[PDB]
Amino acid sequence: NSDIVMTQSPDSLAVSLGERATINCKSSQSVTFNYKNYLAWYQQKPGQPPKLLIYWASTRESGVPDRFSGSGSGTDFTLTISSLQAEDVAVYYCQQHYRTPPTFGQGTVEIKRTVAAPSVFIFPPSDEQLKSGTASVVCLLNNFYPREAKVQWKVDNALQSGNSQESVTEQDSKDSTYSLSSTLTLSKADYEKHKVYACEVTHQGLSSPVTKSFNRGE
Amino acid sequence: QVQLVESGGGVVQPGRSLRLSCAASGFTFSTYAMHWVRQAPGKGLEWVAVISYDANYKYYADSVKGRFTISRDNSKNTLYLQMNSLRAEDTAVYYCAKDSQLRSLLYFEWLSQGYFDYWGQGTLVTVSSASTKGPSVFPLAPSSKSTAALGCLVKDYFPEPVTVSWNSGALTSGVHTFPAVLQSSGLYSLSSVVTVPSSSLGTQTYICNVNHKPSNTKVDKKVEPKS
Amino acid sequence: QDWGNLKRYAEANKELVRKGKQKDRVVFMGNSITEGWVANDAAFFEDNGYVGRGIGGQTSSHFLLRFREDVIKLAPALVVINAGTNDLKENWGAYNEEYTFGNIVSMVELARANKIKVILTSVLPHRNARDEEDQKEATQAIINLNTRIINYAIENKIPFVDYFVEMAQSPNGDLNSSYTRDGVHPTLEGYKVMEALIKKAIDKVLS
Ligand code: NA
């Protein structure tokens, strides 16, 4: 209840490579004491530990490039990347250590690019898997931007809920797109009770939703 | 330079105990407070505990109070975290972190800390009852109405990770191997897909090579158009 | 206008040199806490050969100006320094932790240049009962200054007497109600606690 809350608004930001990235962090109470800002910034790449970027709100750690800078005081702080490099795409943490428990706020920097519609593919379960009692149906959305997409499963035109899971790749190193998989899991008996399996994809790059389908046993 | 090396992580049953260690070098360990910080899968950083330079004071996050104990051996330059009554929500990568301030006086539980100037590599603690299990690998066959997409479904394995290659590493362009998802069974699942010329489907062989070292499993699955 | 207030003890210093040189003299440098110590427990100083040189309201800057006349010229074996309370109070001007700490280091170096042993001490806990945040900020500033002092003391092999840890009560470090009435100056019971700590430290130095 009395823990200092750290909030980044917005908590996600798409920035074009080469352009300015500005991350705002707000504390629930002032973390400035005796002309000193108890605010640190950390950078974390996937699979890597956090790394200190900025301490005392505005002092760069040794080895941090000049394009990173921190500013602010009291309850309002900012981390700025003057010109975004591909190696700067990461998760960023603002941290107060004015009071214990030290607390963190979280935000991500992603690469902004033009809209790209996904290429959609649907995959029926293999006969081998079916023989063991489960059916996995897979819908693939390939190389699209932005990440937001709606994937809706239909079985004999009945909308499915609660029986699918999604996974998304990291932004592609060359074209900055995403790819996404949706897997629908059914029992063998349910799968073999129905004919038409469809995945309907809604995305900003598509003027209307795209549906890929197959008929069981065809 | 300053080094912090954590160890002791692994898969542990809910309710059991686990002791993490953090071996420090490159600085006078006995004159700095030390911290544990953890990061649950797909979540942010959560501070766990602090111990004063002289071990006289220890403070804990509310979420671990009464279950975790922080300690240090200044003669061995080692920091410890004793975790009891482990729960599924304790699953996280656990980091040790050096405090920036020299000999901070942690007389009260709310006082300022330093910033965390150096961090260890982290050690993963997975609190789960799931038995180790190798994956089943199923083809994602290229559509007969096919650039064509094909792949492999790598289903029901524990723990992470698996590795997937195509054609023993000769095929790398166009491959998307998705992050694993934890299923409601407590087992992981993922797919690996690749896009290839539709004209190649009749002549070029596509095999996904799946390796799961925790179970000593290796599967080569040929993915071809379905007859 | 005699900013350092060298006038306060000028005549008392003359009377001391007239009484001759004494063995194992300990001079106490400080503010109203130290001045009130002698006023409230004269026997502790009289029976032990301690000389009090506290002046109420004064900062570490005043102590530095008085150091030669009120410490060095009394040829003591040892000096006990308690400084910082009025620096933090800001009754003489804006607080600067680095300037306050530097004044203490200057006094230590002057004492060591004259073969006078040193005992450094913690700034005492202080009441800021406006609200809970006021007390926490006061306590945090005191601990931050005491942290600089203790680190310097350890590095230079100077004994540090931590009045604070024994007199600051949970949860926010207020001066213990058993040891004070106004929340700033100790009562006699509070002084008894400080006397046990400082006498043990003095006896270890003097052997
Ligand atoms: Na000395």
XYZ file of C-alpha atoms and ligand atoms in Angstrom:
653
model
C 0.000 0.000 0.000
C 2.845 2.383 0.858
C 5.213 0.993 -1.798
C 6.244 3.651 -4.304
C 4.602 2.851 -7.649
C 6.583 3.361 -10.875
C 4.539 3.784 -14.077
C 5.556 4.282 -17.721
C 2.863 5.985 -19.821
C 2.654 4.719 -22.517
C 4.216 1.343 -21.602
C 5.013 0.506 -25.242
C 6.464 2.713 -27.962
C 7.100 2.084 -31.657
C 9.930 4.293 -32.957
C 11.406 4.408 -36.449
C 15.072 3.475 -36.608
C 17.167 6.639 -36.606
C 14.475 8.686 -34.842
C 14.121 9.906 -31.265
C 12.780 7.544 -28.594
C 11.390 9.126 -25.418
C 10.364 6.981 -22.432
C 8.425 8.657 -19.618
C 8.399 7.287 -16.072
C 6.293 8.568 -13.166
C 6.676 7.822 -9.453
C 3.735 7.902 -7.045
C 5.695 10.268 -4.781
C 8.831 12.359 -5.115
C 12.064 10.369 -5.199
C 14.219 13.516 -5.067
C 15.985 14.051 -1.742
C 18.738 16.546 -0.883
C 19.138 17.608 -4.538
C 19.607 13.961 -5.564
C 17.236 11.909 -7.738
C 16.995 8.295 -6.544
C 16.041 7.084 -10.010
C 17.911 4.592 -12.190
C 17.377 3.282 -15.721
C 18.182 -0.264 -16.840
C 18.210 -1.949 -20.245
C 17.353 -5.627 -20.740
C 17.716 -7.587 -23.972
C 15.974 -10.967 -24.366
C 17.658 -13.750 -22.425
C 20.075 -11.219 -20.877
C 20.225 -9.721 -17.369
C 19.336 -6.062 -16.830
C 22.191 -3.604 -17.299
C 22.588 -0.219 -15.626
C 22.162 2.623 -18.134
C 21.596 5.807 -16.098
C 21.986 6.497 -12.382
C 20.992 9.485 -10.241
C 18.430 10.185 -13.016
C 20.956 11.730 -15.425
C 24.450 10.175 -15.112
C 25.440 7.714 -17.841
C 27.190 4.541 -16.752
C 30.622 4.040 -18.302
C 30.372 2.477 -21.747
C 26.799 3.636 -22.409
C 26.679 5.486 -25.763
C 26.130 9.243 -25.891
C 22.707 8.915 -27.546
C 21.229 7.819 -24.186
C 20.307 10.568 -21.729
C 18.121 10.806 -18.643
C 16.384 13.819 -17.139
C 13.651 14.800 -14.706
C 13.141 15.259 -10.987
C 10.522 14.770 -8.311
C 7.929 12.438 -9.825
C 8.546 12.854 -13.585
C 11.510 11.307 -15.395
C 12.490 10.694 -19.009
C 14.926 8.414 -20.836
C 15.811 9.660 -24.326
C 17.537 7.880 -27.203
C 18.466 10.649 -29.631
C 18.671 8.344 -32.674
C 17.362 4.792 -32.320
C 19.780 2.021 -33.297
C 18.727 -1.578 -33.881
C 20.771 -2.633 -30.837
C 18.668 -0.258 -28.696
C 15.479 -2.308 -29.125
C 14.954 -3.732 -25.643
C 12.932 -3.593 -22.449
C 13.686 -0.563 -20.279
C 13.190 -0.271 -16.520
C 12.916 2.831 -14.386
C 13.721 2.128 -10.744
C 13.338 4.174 -7.587
C 15.636 3.378 -4.676
C 14.568 6.313 -2.487
C 12.534 3.926 -0.315
C 12.629 0.219 0.440
C 11.272 -1.838 -1.284
C 12.982 -0.510 -4.404
C 10.404 -0.711 -7.184
C 10.536 -0.875 -10.984
C 8.424 0.320 -13.892
C 8.563 -1.418 -17.258
C 8.315 -0.405 -20.904
C 9.416 -1.650 -24.300
C 10.900 0.073 -27.336
C 10.000 -1.520 -30.666
C 10.799 -0.606 -34.265
C 8.133 1.320 -36.162
C 7.657 0.586 -39.860
C 4.940 0.700 -42.495
C 1.895 -1.561 -42.287
C 2.437 -5.053 -43.717
C -0.404 -7.551 -44.118
C 0.213 -11.145 -42.983
C 0.338 -14.140 -45.265
C -2.033 -16.663 -43.667
C -1.749 -20.473 -43.698
C -3.789 -23.205 -41.985
C -2.480 -26.681 -41.107
C -4.693 -29.687 -40.256
C -3.553 -32.127 -37.565
C -1.448 -35.039 -38.735
C -2.983 -38.497 -38.939
C -0.256 -39.653 -36.538
C -1.300 -37.206 -33.811
C -4.995 -38.056 -34.281
C -4.239 -41.731 -33.614
C -3.118 -40.775 -30.093
C -6.310 -38.906 -29.163
C -5.650 -35.174 -29.718
C -5.942 -32.820 -32.703
C -3.816 -29.671 -33.021
C -4.854 -27.215 -35.748
C -2.337 -24.472 -36.538
C -2.885 -21.068 -38.153
C 0.209 -19.137 -39.254
C 0.396 -15.364 -39.819
C 3.687 -14.607 -41.582
C 5.699 -11.353 -41.700
C 3.205 -8.653 -40.720
C 3.188 -5.246 -38.991
C 1.948 -3.945 -36.555
C 1.757 -6.795 -34.039
C -1.960 -6.346 -33.301
C -4.032 -9.030 -35.015
C -7.243 -10.933 -34.345
C -7.215 -14.678 -35.047
C -10.628 -16.340 -34.758
C -11.135 -20.100 -35.015
C -14.355 -21.496 -36.479
C -15.432 -25.152 -36.520
C -18.455 -25.755 -38.775
C -18.989 -21.972 -38.496
C -19.079 -22.137 -34.668
C -16.742 -19.604 -33.055
C -14.214 -21.234 -30.718
C -13.226 -19.794 -27.334
C -10.831 -20.951 -24.628
C -9.175 -23.752 -26.634
C -6.414 -21.861 -28.485
C -3.035 -20.329 -27.616
C -0.913 -17.831 -29.555
C 2.840 -17.282 -29.899
C 4.655 -14.385 -31.593
C 8.236 -14.047 -32.813
C 10.530 -11.126 -32.107
C 10.696 -8.338 -34.678
C 12.617 -9.512 -37.744
C 16.174 -8.200 -37.927
C 15.831 -7.240 -41.622
C 12.233 -6.095 -42.237
C 11.033 -5.529 -38.630
C 7.912 -7.670 -39.106
C 6.281 -10.164 -36.738
C 5.060 -13.697 -37.303
C 2.363 -15.348 -35.207
C 1.070 -18.876 -34.626
C -2.323 -19.831 -33.210
C -2.878 -23.439 -32.151
C -6.379 -24.843 -31.632
C -6.459 -27.999 -29.490
C -9.389 -30.429 -29.759
C -10.031 -33.964 -28.604
C -10.066 -36.620 -31.314
C -13.827 -37.123 -30.906
C -14.617 -33.410 -31.247
C -12.315 -33.076 -34.265
C -13.895 -36.012 -36.097
C -17.432 -34.709 -35.405
C -17.001 -31.672 -37.676
C -16.029 -30.871 -41.254
C -14.997 -27.233 -41.845
C -12.022 -25.814 -39.923
C -11.260 -22.152 -40.505
C -9.050 -19.433 -39.101
C -10.200 -15.876 -39.755
C -7.537 -13.164 -39.505
C -8.265 -9.470 -38.939
C -5.361 -7.070 -39.427
C -4.856 -3.407 -40.293
C -3.087 -4.405 -43.517
C -6.148 -6.340 -44.736
C -9.124 -4.386 -46.082
C -11.387 -7.224 -44.908
C -10.660 -10.318 -42.797
C -8.876 -13.188 -44.539
C -10.093 -16.744 -43.939
C -8.100 -19.916 -44.614
C -9.967 -23.205 -44.239
C -9.842 -26.939 -44.882
C -12.412 -29.737 -44.884
C -11.540 -32.688 -42.657
C -10.659 -35.668 -44.826
C -10.242 -33.713 -48.065
C 36.242 -6.344 -13.094
C 33.181 -7.025 -10.934
C 31.676 -10.494 -11.400
C 28.564 -12.046 -9.841
C 27.933 -15.739 -10.579
C 24.657 -17.295 -9.418
C 24.020 -21.018 -9.057
C 21.524 -23.414 -7.505
C 18.613 -22.979 -9.902
C 16.618 -25.809 -11.389
C 13.249 -27.535 -11.389
C 11.840 -28.010 -7.878
C 8.559 -29.470 -6.633
C 5.969 -27.104 -5.114
C 6.337 -27.009 -1.344
C 10.019 -27.978 -1.371
C 13.108 -25.870 -0.671
C 16.008 -24.542 -2.729
C 19.187 -22.619 -1.884
C 20.714 -20.168 -4.362
C 24.296 -18.922 -4.143
C 25.980 -15.873 -5.671
C 29.788 -15.840 -5.773
C 31.225 -12.319 -5.966
C 34.613 -11.054 -7.124
C 36.245 -7.837 -8.270
C 35.112 -5.671 -5.343
C 35.284 -5.655 -1.545
C 32.149 -7.755 -1.066
C 32.166 -7.343 2.732
C 31.532 -3.560 2.546
C 28.416 -3.502 0.322
C 24.801 -4.450 0.778
C 23.635 -7.157 -1.626
C 20.221 -7.743 -3.215
C 18.184 -10.507 -4.806
C 15.830 -9.559 -7.652
C 13.630 -11.936 -9.645
C 11.778 -11.891 -12.958
C 8.858 -14.241 -13.577
C 8.347 -15.520 -17.162
C 7.199 -12.636 -19.351
C 6.973 -10.182 -16.435
C 9.013 -7.336 -14.960
C 11.599 -7.124 -12.195
C 10.602 -7.687 -8.559
C 12.999 -6.926 -5.708
C 13.212 -9.880 -3.311
C 15.526 -9.057 -0.401
C 18.492 -7.029 0.841
C 21.201 -7.834 3.379
C 23.457 -5.211 4.931
C 27.222 -5.356 4.443
C 27.711 -6.773 7.961
C 24.638 -9.091 7.830
C 23.105 -7.203 10.778
C 20.012 -6.172 8.792
C 17.847 -8.100 6.321
C 14.614 -6.941 4.673
C 12.242 -8.814 2.370
C 9.493 -8.230 -0.146
C 6.036 -8.854 1.309
C 5.516 -11.625 -1.264
C 8.368 -13.730 0.194
C 8.294 -12.728 3.887
C 8.381 -15.753 6.177
C 9.458 -18.150 3.406
C 12.778 -16.753 2.120
C 15.966 -16.108 4.095
C 18.868 -14.016 2.792
C 22.361 -14.551 4.193
C 26.005 -13.980 3.329
C 29.464 -15.383 4.061
C 31.901 -12.476 3.843
C 34.910 -14.792 4.196
C 33.739 -16.704 1.096
C 32.479 -13.585 -0.753
C 29.202 -15.437 -1.317
C 25.564 -14.363 -1.005
C 22.781 -16.889 -0.354
C 18.997 -17.050 -0.705
C 17.250 -19.864 1.176
C 13.814 -20.455 -0.372
C 11.291 -22.537 1.584
C 7.697 -23.571 0.835
C 8.182 -22.782 -2.837
C 5.087 -21.949 -4.881
C 4.387 -21.888 -8.608
C 4.428 -18.078 -8.551
C 8.012 -18.165 -7.235
C 9.048 -19.372 -10.709
C 11.488 -16.777 -12.028
C 15.010 -16.009 -13.064
C 16.735 -14.952 -9.839
C 19.457 -12.297 -10.017
C 21.887 -11.193 -7.373
C 22.768 -7.516 -7.544
C 25.370 -5.331 -5.876
C 24.257 -2.205 -4.048
C 25.994 0.989 -5.169
C 26.425 2.478 -1.676
C 29.440 1.828 0.562
C 28.484 0.380 3.984
C 24.894 1.604 3.976
C 23.318 1.800 7.458
C 20.058 -0.133 7.039
C 18.704 0.590 10.522
C 15.076 0.657 9.325
C 13.100 -1.282 6.732
C 12.126 1.722 4.566
C 15.492 3.496 4.184
C 17.037 4.346 0.825
C 19.062 1.741 -1.030
C 21.657 2.300 -3.698
C 21.063 1.688 -7.335
C 21.956 -1.801 -8.572
C 25.294 -1.194 -10.263
C 26.184 -4.817 -11.124
C 24.003 -7.873 -11.778
C 24.670 -11.584 -12.066
C 23.747 -13.702 -15.058
C 20.676 -15.085 -13.299
C 19.625 -18.603 -12.363
C 16.252 -20.022 -13.365
C 13.995 -21.475 -10.667
C 11.072 -23.491 -12.040
C 8.550 -24.557 -9.396
C 6.567 -27.369 -11.009
C 5.678 -31.005 -10.419
C 5.894 -31.890 -14.123
C 8.069 -34.866 -14.997
C 10.778 -34.506 -17.617
C 9.339 -35.560 -20.971
C 10.583 -35.485 -24.547
C 8.442 -33.961 -27.287
C 6.327 -35.574 -29.939
C 7.013 -34.035 -33.351
C 4.250 -33.748 -35.950
C 4.411 -32.360 -39.496
C 2.712 -29.147 -40.554
C 2.269 -30.322 -44.120
C 2.362 -27.851 -47.042
C -1.076 -27.119 -48.457
C -1.939 -28.802 -51.753
C -3.346 -25.454 -52.962
C -0.003 -23.633 -52.557
C 5.549 -19.499 -51.887
C 4.439 -22.373 -49.647
C 4.602 -22.757 -45.869
C 5.421 -25.923 -43.952
C 6.692 -26.769 -40.511
C 6.792 -29.005 -37.466
C 4.717 -29.020 -34.287
C 6.881 -29.846 -31.257
C 4.371 -30.848 -28.588
C 4.313 -31.827 -24.909
C 7.858 -31.494 -23.543
C 9.332 -30.452 -20.206
C 11.422 -28.562 -19.245
C 12.570 -25.950 -21.738
C 14.347 -25.723 -24.121
C 14.145 -27.570 -27.413
C 16.194 -26.571 -30.439
C 14.893 -26.841 -34.007
C 16.894 -26.772 -37.232
C 15.889 -27.514 -40.817
C 17.808 -29.885 -43.097
C 20.590 -30.154 -40.487
C 21.196 -26.407 -40.652
C 21.384 -26.175 -44.449
C 18.011 -24.356 -44.465
C 17.972 -21.152 -42.405
C 16.299 -18.561 -44.640
C 12.582 -18.075 -44.007
C 12.513 -20.069 -40.749
C 10.346 -18.883 -37.850
C 10.683 -20.955 -34.667
C 8.083 -19.644 -32.242
C 8.548 -19.167 -28.490
C 7.217 -22.071 -26.470
C 3.835 -21.797 -24.759
C 3.070 -23.509 -21.461
C -0.009 -25.665 -21.974
C -2.676 -26.464 -19.382
C -0.905 -29.822 -18.901
C 2.176 -28.062 -17.541
C 4.020 -29.194 -20.690
C 5.440 -26.892 -23.352
C 4.571 -26.718 -27.044
C 5.946 -24.808 -30.008
C 5.949 -24.796 -33.782
C 8.716 -24.115 -36.274
C 7.722 -23.058 -39.789
C 9.537 -22.162 -42.999
C 8.443 -20.684 -46.322
C 9.895 -22.203 -49.501
C 9.197 -22.021 -53.241
C 6.057 -23.954 -54.144
C 7.975 -25.437 -57.088
C 10.449 -27.085 -54.681
C 7.799 -29.187 -52.898
C 8.078 -32.055 -55.385
C 11.876 -32.310 -55.440
C 13.371 -30.829 -52.242
C 13.256 -32.770 -48.976
C 12.444 -30.824 -45.802
C 13.352 -32.347 -42.432
C 13.071 -30.618 -39.067
C 15.693 -31.642 -36.508
C 14.363 -31.403 -32.945
C 16.627 -31.779 -29.908
C 15.507 -31.928 -26.259
C 18.633 -32.308 -24.132
C 16.899 -32.688 -20.704
C 15.290 -35.949 -21.894
C 18.070 -36.967 -24.330
C 15.550 -36.829 -27.186
C 16.393 -36.209 -30.837
C 13.790 -36.465 -33.610
C 14.194 -35.928 -37.358
C 10.762 -35.462 -38.952
C 10.336 -35.371 -42.723
C 7.628 -32.884 -43.744
C 6.095 -33.593 -47.149
C 2.812 -32.922 -48.965
C 0.132 -35.268 -47.689
C -1.147 -37.987 -50.013
C 31.024 40.180 15.441
C 32.969 37.017 16.406
C 31.120 34.634 14.114
C 32.786 31.514 15.530
C 32.035 32.651 19.114
C 35.601 32.264 20.346
C 34.532 34.655 23.125
C 32.314 32.048 24.795
C 35.161 29.976 26.285
C 38.037 32.482 26.055
C 38.120 33.204 29.789
C 37.437 29.577 30.743
C 40.393 28.510 28.577
C 42.696 30.974 30.367
C 41.642 29.597 33.756
C 42.462 26.083 32.530
C 46.039 26.820 31.430
C 46.549 28.449 34.836
C 45.547 25.221 36.600
C 48.349 23.452 34.702
C 48.506 20.548 32.285
C 46.384 17.501 33.099
C 46.828 13.841 32.234
C 44.318 12.138 29.926
C 42.245 15.255 29.252
C 39.277 14.663 26.930
C 37.619 17.647 25.224
C 34.026 17.324 23.959
C 33.255 19.418 20.852
C 29.617 19.922 19.918
C 26.448 21.992 20.099
C 23.615 22.265 22.648
C 23.613 18.486 23.122
C 27.219 18.764 24.327
C 26.725 22.049 26.210
C 23.612 20.681 27.920
C 25.514 17.494 28.772
C 27.820 19.391 31.139
C 24.920 21.448 32.503
C 22.882 18.305 33.226
C 25.589 15.874 34.454
C 28.525 17.914 35.753
C 29.886 14.940 37.714
C 30.429 12.873 34.553
C 32.848 15.522 33.294
C 34.324 16.546 36.656
C 34.961 13.015 37.954
C 36.563 11.810 34.703
C 38.704 14.797 33.720
C 36.556 15.674 30.698
C 36.229 19.241 29.405
C 33.026 20.302 27.652
C 33.267 22.842 24.842
C 29.759 22.743 23.404
C 27.912 25.841 22.203
C 24.205 25.695 21.427
C 23.066 26.476 17.898
C 26.502 26.017 16.309
C 27.351 24.140 13.106
C 30.443 22.200 12.069
C 31.698 25.450 10.494
C 31.703 27.143 13.905
C 33.479 24.126 15.416
C 36.259 24.372 12.828
C 36.863 28.037 13.694
C 36.949 27.250 17.439
C 39.016 24.068 17.108
C 42.475 25.501 17.792
C 41.504 27.709 20.748
C 38.943 25.369 22.326
C 40.635 22.007 21.617
C 44.263 22.156 20.465
C 45.421 24.791 22.965
C 43.980 22.767 25.851
C 46.557 20.057 24.960
C 44.093 17.168 25.410
C 44.877 13.518 24.909
C 41.624 13.015 22.997
C 38.796 14.989 21.380
C 35.196 13.760 21.029
C 33.458 15.348 18.024
C 29.658 15.504 17.708
C 28.698 17.740 14.786
C 25.927 18.037 12.223
C 22.638 18.592 14.052
C 22.516 22.332 13.381
C 23.984 21.906 9.896
C 20.870 19.843 9.130
C 18.604 22.246 11.046
C 19.653 25.060 8.650
C 19.357 27.768 11.319
C 22.581 29.336 9.948
C 22.048 28.628 6.245
C 21.373 25.948 3.674
C 22.604 22.450 4.463
C 25.366 20.925 2.344
C 26.315 17.382 3.377
C 29.679 17.636 1.604
C 30.611 20.880 3.385
C 29.532 19.517 6.781
C 31.476 16.284 6.257
C 34.497 18.275 5.072
C 34.488 20.375 8.252
C 34.632 17.187 10.328
C 37.545 15.876 8.251
C 39.340 19.207 8.733
C 38.952 18.954 12.516
C 40.266 15.369 12.498
C 43.314 16.407 10.478
C 43.987 19.339 12.823
C 43.752 17.012 15.829
C 46.062 14.416 14.276
C 48.531 17.137 13.251
C 48.786 17.910 16.984
C 48.953 14.286 18.230
C 45.413 14.493 19.626
C 43.419 11.272 19.349
C 39.909 11.423 17.883
C 36.569 9.764 18.580
C 33.882 10.525 16.005
C 30.217 10.175 16.924
C 26.842 9.905 15.227
C 24.480 12.820 14.794
C 21.682 12.096 17.258
C 18.123 11.224 16.190
C 15.855 14.231 15.764
C 12.099 14.664 16.118
C 10.166 15.966 13.091
C 6.631 15.230 14.297
C 4.751 17.289 11.673
C 3.855 14.041 9.905
C 5.343 10.633 9.160
C 7.073 11.770 5.960
C 8.735 14.640 7.836
C 10.169 12.229 10.411
C 11.377 9.829 7.717
C 13.096 12.628 5.782
C 14.805 13.923 8.932
C 15.951 10.413 9.869
C 17.149 9.661 6.331
C 19.259 12.833 6.202
C 20.837 12.030 9.579
C 21.680 8.469 8.531
C 23.128 9.709 5.230
C 25.513 12.072 7.042
C 26.400 9.455 9.662
C 27.142 7.021 6.822
C 29.790 9.406 5.459
C 31.273 9.787 8.946
C 31.446 6.064 9.726
C 33.017 5.239 6.349
C 35.675 7.894 6.911
C 36.240 6.641 10.469
C 36.706 3.010 9.404
C 39.017 3.993 6.544
C 41.212 6.073 8.873
C 41.052 3.769 11.935
C 39.138 6.304 14.054
C 36.666 4.981 16.653
C 33.040 5.798 15.868
C 30.455 5.907 18.659
C 26.943 5.228 17.356
C 24.635 7.056 19.744
C 22.005 6.997 16.992
C 21.486 3.238 16.726
C 20.810 3.001 20.469
C 18.659 6.146 20.790
C 16.563 6.037 17.587
C 13.373 4.028 18.046
C 11.285 2.200 15.470
C 9.529 2.647 13.111
C 10.837 6.010 11.813
C 13.897 6.779 13.941
C 12.389 9.327 16.324
C 14.479 10.099 19.387
C 13.330 7.606 22.024
C 10.693 9.097 24.322
C 12.530 7.596 27.305
C 15.595 9.695 26.410
C 14.082 13.099 25.580
C 11.303 15.582 26.282
C 11.585 18.075 23.395
C 12.684 15.476 20.826
C 16.040 17.221 20.257
C 17.997 17.417 23.507
C 18.526 14.354 25.703
C 17.220 14.127 29.228
C 19.471 12.892 32.031
C 18.371 9.319 31.308
C 19.310 9.860 27.669
C 22.700 11.253 28.670
C 23.343 8.177 30.838
C 23.018 5.998 27.729
C 25.483 8.205 25.846
C 27.880 8.215 28.808
C 28.184 4.418 28.891
C 28.990 4.328 25.168
C 31.498 7.183 25.098
C 33.262 6.229 28.344
C 33.896 2.700 27.060
C 35.346 4.182 23.865
C 37.470 6.761 25.707
C 38.907 4.144 28.068
C 39.878 1.940 25.114
C 41.742 4.822 23.449
C 43.425 6.100 26.625
C 44.291 2.512 27.661
Na 43.033 9.286 16.022
